[PDB]
Coordinates of C-alpha atoms (C1' of nucleotides) and ligand atoms in Angstrom, one line a residue:
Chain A
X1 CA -50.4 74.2 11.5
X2 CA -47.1 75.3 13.1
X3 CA -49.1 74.7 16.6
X4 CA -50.1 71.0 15.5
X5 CA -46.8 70.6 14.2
X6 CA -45.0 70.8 17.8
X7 CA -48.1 68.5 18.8
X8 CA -46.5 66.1 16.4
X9 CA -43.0 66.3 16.8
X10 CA -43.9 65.6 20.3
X11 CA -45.8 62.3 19.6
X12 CA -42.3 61.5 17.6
X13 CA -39.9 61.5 20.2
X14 CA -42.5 58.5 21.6
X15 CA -42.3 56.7 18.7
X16 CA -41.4 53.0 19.1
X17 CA -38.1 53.7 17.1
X18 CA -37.3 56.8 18.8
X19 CA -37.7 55.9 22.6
X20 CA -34.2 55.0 24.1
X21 CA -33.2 51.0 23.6
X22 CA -33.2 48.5 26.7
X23 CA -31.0 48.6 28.9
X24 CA -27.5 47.0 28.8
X25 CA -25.5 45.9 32.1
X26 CA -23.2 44.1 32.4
X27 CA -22.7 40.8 35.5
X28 CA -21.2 43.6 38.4
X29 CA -23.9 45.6 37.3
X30 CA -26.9 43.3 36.5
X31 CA -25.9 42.0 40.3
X32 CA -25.9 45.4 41.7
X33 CA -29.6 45.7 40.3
X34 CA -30.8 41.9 41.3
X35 CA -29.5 43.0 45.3
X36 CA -31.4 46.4 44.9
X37 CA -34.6 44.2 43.6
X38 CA -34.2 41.6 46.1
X39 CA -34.4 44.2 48.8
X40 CA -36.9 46.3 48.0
X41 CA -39.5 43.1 47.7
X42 CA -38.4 42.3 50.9
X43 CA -38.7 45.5 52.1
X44 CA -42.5 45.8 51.3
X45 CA -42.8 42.2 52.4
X46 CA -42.1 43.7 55.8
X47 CA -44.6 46.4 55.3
X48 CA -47.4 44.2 54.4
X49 CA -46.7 42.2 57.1
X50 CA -46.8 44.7 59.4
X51 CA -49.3 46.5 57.6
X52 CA -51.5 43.6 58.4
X53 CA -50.4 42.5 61.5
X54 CA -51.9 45.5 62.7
X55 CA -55.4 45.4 60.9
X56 CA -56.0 41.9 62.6
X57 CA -54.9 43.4 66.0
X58 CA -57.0 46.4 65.4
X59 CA -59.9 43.7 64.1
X60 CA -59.1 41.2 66.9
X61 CA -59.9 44.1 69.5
X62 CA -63.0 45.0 67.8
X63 CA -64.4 41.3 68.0
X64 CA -63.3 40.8 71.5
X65 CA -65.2 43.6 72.3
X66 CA -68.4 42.8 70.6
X67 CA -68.4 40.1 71.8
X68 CA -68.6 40.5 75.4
X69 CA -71.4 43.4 74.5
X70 CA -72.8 40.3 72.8
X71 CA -73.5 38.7 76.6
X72 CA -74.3 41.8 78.6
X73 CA -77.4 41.8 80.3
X74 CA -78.3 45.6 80.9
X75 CA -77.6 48.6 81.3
X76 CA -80.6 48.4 84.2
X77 CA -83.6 45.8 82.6
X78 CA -82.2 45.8 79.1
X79 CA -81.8 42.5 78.3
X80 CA -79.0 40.8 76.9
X81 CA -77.7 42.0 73.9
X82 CA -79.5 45.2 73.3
X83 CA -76.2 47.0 73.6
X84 CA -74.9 44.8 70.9
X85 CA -77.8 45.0 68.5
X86 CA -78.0 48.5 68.5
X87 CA -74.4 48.6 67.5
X88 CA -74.6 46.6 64.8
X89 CA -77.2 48.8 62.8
X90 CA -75.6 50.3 59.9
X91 CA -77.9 53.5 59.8
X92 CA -76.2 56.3 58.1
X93 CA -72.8 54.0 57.3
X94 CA -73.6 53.8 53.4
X95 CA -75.0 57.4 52.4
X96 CA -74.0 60.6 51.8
X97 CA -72.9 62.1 55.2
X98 CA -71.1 59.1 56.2
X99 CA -67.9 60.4 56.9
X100 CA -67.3 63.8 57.4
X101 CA -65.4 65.7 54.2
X102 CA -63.1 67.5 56.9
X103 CA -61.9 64.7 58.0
X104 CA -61.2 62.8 54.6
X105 CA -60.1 65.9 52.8
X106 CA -57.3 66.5 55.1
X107 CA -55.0 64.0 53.3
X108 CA -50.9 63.9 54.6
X109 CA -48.2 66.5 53.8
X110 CA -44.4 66.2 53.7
X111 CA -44.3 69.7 56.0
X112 CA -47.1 71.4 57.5
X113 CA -48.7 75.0 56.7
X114 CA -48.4 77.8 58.2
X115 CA -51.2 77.2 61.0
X116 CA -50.5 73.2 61.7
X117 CA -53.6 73.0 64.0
X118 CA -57.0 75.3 64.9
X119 CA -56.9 75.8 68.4
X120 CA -59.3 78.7 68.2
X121 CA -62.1 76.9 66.4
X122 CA -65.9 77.4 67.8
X123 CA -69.0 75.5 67.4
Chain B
X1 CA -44.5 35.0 17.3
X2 CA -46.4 37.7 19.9
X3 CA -45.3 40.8 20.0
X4 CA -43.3 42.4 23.4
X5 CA -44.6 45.6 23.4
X6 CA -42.0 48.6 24.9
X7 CA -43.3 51.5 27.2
X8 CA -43.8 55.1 25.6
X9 CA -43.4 57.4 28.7
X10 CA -42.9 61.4 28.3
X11 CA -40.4 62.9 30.3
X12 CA -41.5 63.0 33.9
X13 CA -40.4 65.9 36.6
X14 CA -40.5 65.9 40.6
X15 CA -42.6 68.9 41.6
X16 CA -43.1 70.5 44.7
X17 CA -46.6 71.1 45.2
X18 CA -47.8 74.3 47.6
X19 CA -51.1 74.3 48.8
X20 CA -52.8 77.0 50.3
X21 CA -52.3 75.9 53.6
X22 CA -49.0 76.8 53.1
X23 CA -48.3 73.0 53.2
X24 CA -45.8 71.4 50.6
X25 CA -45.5 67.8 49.2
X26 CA -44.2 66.3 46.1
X27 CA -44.9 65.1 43.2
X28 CA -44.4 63.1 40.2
X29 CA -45.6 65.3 36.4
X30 CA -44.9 66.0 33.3
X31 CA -44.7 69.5 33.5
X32 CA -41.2 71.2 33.7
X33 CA -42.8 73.5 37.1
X34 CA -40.3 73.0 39.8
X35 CA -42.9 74.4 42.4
X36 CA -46.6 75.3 42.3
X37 CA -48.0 77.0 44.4
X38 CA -52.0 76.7 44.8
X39 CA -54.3 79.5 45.6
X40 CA -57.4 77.8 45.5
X41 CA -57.8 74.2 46.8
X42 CA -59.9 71.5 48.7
X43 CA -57.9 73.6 51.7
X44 CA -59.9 76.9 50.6
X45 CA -63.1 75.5 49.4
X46 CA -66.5 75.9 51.6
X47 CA -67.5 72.4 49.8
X48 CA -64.4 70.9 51.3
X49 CA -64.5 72.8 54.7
X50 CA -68.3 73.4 55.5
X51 CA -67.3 74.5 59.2
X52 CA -64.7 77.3 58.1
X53 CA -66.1 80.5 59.0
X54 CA -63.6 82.6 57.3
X55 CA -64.9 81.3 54.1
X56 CA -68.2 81.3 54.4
X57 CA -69.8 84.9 53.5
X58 CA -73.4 85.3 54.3
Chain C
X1 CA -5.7 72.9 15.6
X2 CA -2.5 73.0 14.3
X3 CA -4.1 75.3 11.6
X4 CA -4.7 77.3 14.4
X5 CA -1.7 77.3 15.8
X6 CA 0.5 78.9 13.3
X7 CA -2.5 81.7 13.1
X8 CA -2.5 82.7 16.7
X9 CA 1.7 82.4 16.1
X10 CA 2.2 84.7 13.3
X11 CA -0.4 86.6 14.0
X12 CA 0.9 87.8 17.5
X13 CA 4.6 87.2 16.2
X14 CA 3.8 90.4 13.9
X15 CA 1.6 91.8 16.1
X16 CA 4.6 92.7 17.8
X17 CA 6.3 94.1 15.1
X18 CA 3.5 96.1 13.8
X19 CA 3.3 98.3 17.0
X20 CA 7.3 98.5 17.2
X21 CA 7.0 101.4 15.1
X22 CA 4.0 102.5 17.0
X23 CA 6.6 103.7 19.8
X24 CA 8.3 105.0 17.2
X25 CA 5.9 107.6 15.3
X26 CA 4.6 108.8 19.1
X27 CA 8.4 109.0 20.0
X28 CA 8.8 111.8 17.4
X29 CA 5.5 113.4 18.2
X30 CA 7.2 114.4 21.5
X31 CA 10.2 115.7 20.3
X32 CA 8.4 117.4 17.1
X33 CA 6.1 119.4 20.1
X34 CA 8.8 121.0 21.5
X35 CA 9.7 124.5 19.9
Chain D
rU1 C1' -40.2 35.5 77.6
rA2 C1' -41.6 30.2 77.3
rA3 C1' -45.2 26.0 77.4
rU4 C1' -50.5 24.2 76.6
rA5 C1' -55.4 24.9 74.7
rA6 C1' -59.0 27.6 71.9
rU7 C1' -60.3 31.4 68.2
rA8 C1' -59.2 34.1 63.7
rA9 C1' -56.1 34.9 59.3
rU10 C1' -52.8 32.4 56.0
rC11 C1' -51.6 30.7 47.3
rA12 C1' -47.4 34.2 47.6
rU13 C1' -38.9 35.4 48.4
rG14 C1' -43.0 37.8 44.5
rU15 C1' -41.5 45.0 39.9
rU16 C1' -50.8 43.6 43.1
rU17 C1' -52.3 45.9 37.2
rA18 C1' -50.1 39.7 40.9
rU19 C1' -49.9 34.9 38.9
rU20 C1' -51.7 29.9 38.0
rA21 C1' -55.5 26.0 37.6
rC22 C1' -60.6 25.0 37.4
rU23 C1' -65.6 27.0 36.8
rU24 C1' -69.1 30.8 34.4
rA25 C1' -77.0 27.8 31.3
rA26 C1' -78.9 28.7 26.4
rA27 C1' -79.1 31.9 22.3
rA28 C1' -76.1 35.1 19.7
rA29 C1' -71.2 37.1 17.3
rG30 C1' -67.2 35.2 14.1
rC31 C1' -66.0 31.3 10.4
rU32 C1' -66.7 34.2 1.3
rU33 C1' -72.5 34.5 0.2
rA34 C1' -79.2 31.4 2.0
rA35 C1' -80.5 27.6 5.3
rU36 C1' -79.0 23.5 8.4
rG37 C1' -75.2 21.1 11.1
rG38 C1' -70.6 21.9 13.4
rC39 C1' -66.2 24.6 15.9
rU40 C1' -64.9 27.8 21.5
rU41 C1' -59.9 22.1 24.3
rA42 C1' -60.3 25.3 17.3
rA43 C1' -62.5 25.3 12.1
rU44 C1' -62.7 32.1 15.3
rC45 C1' -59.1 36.3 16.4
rU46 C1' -53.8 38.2 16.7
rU47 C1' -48.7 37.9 15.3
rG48 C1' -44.1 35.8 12.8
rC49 C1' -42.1 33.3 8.7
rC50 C1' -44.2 31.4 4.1
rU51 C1' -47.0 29.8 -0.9
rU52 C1' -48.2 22.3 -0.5
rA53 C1' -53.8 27.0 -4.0
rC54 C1' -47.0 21.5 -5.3
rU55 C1' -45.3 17.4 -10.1
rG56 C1' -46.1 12.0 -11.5
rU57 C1' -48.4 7.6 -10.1
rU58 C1' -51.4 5.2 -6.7
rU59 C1' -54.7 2.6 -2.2
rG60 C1' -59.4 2.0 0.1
rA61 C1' -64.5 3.9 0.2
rU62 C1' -69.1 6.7 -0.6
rU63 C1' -72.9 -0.6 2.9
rA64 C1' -70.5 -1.0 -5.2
rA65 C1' -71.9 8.2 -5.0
rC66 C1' -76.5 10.0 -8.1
rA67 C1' -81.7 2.8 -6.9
rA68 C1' -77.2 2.5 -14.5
rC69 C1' -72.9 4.6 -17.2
rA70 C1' -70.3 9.3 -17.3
rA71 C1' -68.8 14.1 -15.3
rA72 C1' -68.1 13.8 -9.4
rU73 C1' -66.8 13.6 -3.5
rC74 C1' -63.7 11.8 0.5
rU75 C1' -59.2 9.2 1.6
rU76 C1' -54.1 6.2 1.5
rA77 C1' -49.1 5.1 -0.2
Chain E
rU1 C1' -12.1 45.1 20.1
rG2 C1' -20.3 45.4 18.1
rU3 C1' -22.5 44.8 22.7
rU4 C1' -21.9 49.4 28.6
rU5 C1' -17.0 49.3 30.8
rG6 C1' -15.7 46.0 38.2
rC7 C1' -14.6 40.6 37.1
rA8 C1' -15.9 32.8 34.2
rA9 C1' -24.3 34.7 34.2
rU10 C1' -28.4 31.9 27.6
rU11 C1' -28.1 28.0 23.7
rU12 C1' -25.2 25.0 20.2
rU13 C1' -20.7 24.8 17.6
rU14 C1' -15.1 25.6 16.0
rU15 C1' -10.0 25.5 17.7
rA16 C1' -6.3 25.0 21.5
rU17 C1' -4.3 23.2 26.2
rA18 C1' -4.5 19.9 30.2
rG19 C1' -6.3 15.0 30.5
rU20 C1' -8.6 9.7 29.4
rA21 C1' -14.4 10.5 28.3
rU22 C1' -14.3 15.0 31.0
rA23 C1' -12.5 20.5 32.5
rU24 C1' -11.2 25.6 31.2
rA25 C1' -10.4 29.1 27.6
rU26 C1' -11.4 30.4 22.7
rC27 C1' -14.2 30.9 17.9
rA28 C1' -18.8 31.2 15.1
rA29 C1' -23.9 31.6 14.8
rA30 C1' -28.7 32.6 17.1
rU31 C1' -31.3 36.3 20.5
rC32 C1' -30.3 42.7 20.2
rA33 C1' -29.0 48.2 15.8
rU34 C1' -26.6 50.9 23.3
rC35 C1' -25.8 55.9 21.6
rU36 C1' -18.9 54.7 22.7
rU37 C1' -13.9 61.0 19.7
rU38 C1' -10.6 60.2 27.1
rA39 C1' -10.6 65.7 24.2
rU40 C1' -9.6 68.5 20.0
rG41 C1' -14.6 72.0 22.4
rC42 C1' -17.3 74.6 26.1
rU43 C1' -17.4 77.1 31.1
rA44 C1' -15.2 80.1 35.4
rU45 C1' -11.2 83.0 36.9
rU46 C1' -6.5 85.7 36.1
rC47 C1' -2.7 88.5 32.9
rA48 C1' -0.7 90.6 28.8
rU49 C1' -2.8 93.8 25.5
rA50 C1' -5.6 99.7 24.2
rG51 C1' -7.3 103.1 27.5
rA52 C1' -12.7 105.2 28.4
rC53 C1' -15.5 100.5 27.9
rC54 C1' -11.4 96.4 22.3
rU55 C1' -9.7 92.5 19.5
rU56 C1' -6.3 88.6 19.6
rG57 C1' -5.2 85.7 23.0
rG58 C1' -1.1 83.1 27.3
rG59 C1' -1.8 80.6 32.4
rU60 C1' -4.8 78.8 36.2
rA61 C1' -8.9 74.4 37.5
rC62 C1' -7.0 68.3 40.1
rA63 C1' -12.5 66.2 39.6
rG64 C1' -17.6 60.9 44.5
rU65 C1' -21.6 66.2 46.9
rA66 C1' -17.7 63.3 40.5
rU67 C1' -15.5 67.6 37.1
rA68 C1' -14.3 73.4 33.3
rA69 C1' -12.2 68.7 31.5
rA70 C1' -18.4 67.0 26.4
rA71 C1' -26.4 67.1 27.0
rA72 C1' -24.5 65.1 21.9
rU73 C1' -19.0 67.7 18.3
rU74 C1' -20.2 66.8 10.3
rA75 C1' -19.5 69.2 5.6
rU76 C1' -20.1 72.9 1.8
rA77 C1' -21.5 77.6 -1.8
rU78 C1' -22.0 82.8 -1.9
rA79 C1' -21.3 87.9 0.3
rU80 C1' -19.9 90.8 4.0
rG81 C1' -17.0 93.6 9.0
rU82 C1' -12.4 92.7 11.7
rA83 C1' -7.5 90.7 11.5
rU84 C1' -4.1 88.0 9.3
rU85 C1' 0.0 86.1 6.6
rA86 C1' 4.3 85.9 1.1
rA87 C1' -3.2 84.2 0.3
rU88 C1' -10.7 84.8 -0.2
rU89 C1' -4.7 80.9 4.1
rU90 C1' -6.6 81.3 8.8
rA91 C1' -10.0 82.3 12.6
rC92 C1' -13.9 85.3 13.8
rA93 C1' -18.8 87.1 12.9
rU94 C1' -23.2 86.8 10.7
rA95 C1' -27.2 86.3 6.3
rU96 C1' -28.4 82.9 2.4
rA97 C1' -28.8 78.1 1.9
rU98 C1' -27.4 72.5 1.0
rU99 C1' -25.7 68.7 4.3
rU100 C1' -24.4 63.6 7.5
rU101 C1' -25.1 62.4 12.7
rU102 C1' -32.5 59.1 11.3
rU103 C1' -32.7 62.6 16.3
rC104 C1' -38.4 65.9 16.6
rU105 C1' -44.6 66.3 10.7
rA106 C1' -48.3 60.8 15.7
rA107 C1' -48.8 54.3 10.9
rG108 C1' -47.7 51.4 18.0
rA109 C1' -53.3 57.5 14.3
rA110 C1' -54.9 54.6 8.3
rA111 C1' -56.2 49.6 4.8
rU112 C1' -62.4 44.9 7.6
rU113 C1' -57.1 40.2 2.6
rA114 C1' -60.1 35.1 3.6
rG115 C1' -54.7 30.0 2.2
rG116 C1' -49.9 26.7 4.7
rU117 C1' -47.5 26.3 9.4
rA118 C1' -46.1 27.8 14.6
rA119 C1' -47.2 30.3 18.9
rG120 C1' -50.5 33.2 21.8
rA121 C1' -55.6 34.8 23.1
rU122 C1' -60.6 32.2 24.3
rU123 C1' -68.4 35.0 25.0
rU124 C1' -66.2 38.3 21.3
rU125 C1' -73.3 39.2 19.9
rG126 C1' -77.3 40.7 22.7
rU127 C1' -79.0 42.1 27.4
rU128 C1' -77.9 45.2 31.5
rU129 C1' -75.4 49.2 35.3
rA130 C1' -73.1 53.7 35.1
rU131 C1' -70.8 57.5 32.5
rA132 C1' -69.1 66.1 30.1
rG133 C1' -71.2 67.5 25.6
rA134 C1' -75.2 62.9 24.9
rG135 C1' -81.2 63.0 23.3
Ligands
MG1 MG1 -45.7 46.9 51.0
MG2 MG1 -60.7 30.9 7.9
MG3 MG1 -50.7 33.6 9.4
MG4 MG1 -75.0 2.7 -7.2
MG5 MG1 -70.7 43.2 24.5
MG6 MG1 -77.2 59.7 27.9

RNA sequence: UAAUAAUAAUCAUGUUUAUUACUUAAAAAGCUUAAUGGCUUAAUCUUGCCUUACUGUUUGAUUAACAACAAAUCUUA
RNA sequence: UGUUUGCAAUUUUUUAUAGUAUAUAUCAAAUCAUCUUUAUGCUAUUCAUAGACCUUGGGUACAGUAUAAAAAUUAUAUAUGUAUUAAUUUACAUAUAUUUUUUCUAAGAAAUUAGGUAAGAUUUUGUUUAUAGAG
């Protein structure tokens, strides 16, 4: 009981007549907040942008590519497209091993370890 | 006449998170934990790391 | 505070006072040592 | 860096959990109780405020209610 | 002084001024319970004050990297140690409680409520895919 009663008292302070009101500014202040909103919208308007611009230029690389291979005759008497076809085949793309869980696992840090990198590593 | 329903948020705390790398982020909890430090992670895990020698014991 | 005020005064105005004769008394222990 | 042509993308000045409009067979669920019909653009559901589930009289119909009359049903002022 | 504290930002209305119908201010109502002591307390430091580590207290602090200068201040009954004064006055320190600040035992965890009106929502059934315990 006096365990589930600090449960409960803690479901209290979220009570819709407990939570703290809406806030209150006043013009200085509601302007102050409308310059801040304003900017960061406009800020992730320039990330998506860029975000994107990127992806198509990474995309537009990618097709410019495959599509020369597309009208490649060889190498030697491969005719053309062979190049092309085989790297369009998905095999392996949608299974288990796909991508490598060393790779994916090592997700971004705000300061690195101890040991940044693995120089030493060995097959 | 629908209702506008208000948000019912906990207190939330910026934590430092330590992984066993040694390696530090932060993040956003409601636990009062200013830093935690992390012995045993994805960065210490054979499951995670399949060509880490150091943890592999055969 | 006020209330206060006239405590911490009379209280230390006496205070005073009260150990005035506490020279006193370890005045005459001196002089009552000798011979 | 500019011009021209071609190709691709392009709702977005907006706290992407976007938003908005249109579209998504039939049956079924729900709508006081069987069955039938109907409603999804409301007759269902949710919420707010309410009690017109009012008083008197009254119009036009039910191819002149029930192949008469009466008790009835719908509707107008 | 209700309305967030740096400044004509919603709707309609009252009154006043200028003005010949408009313009500004103002008032009320609607929408919303935002919490408001400018410090009286706390904190740090120093000194008197005993003296082998004590009470009570007097100054100091100068605040945008805001600050000691309010992270939340009420009131009462009994009894006690210290000290007080012409007082169980006062402050201190507790213990016992009772208290306002609604601010700490989840109704936004419960009830199948069926009519009027207004707004909002628009496949809710079944089938099917997956999902700790779970068949
Ligand atoms: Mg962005
Ligand atoms: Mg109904
Ligand atoms: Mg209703
Ligand atoms: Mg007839
Ligand atoms: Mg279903
Ligand atoms: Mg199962």
């Amino acid at each position: 009981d006096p365990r589930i009663i600090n449960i409960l008292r803690h479901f209290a302070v979220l009570s819709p007549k407990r939570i703290p009101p809406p806030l209150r500014f006043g013009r200085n202040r509601y302007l102050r907040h409308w310059t801040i909103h304003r900017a960061w919208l406009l800020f992730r308007r320039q990330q998506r942008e860029q975000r994107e611009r990127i992806l198509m230029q990474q995309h537009q690389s990618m097709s410019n590519a495959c599509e020369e291979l597309r009208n490649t005759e060889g190498p030697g008497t491969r005719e053309t497209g062979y190049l092309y076809r085989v790297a369009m085949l998905k095999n392996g793309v949608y299974g288990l091993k796909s991508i490598p869980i060393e790779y994916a696992s090592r997700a971004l840090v705000e300061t690195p370890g101890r040991q940044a990198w693995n120089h030493e590593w060995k097959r | 006449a629908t209702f506008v329903p208000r948000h019912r948020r906990p207190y939330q705390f910026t934590q430092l998170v330590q992984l066993s790398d040694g390696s530090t982020f932060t993040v956003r909890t409601t636990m009062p934990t200013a830093l935690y430090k992390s012995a045993k992670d994805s960065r210490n895990h054979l499951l995670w790391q399949p060509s880490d020698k150091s943890l592999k014991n055969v | 505070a006020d209330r206060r005020e006239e405590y911490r005064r009379r209280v230390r105005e006496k205070r005073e006072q009260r150990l005035v004769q506490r020279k006193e008394f370890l005045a005459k222990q001196r002089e009552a040592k000798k011979a």
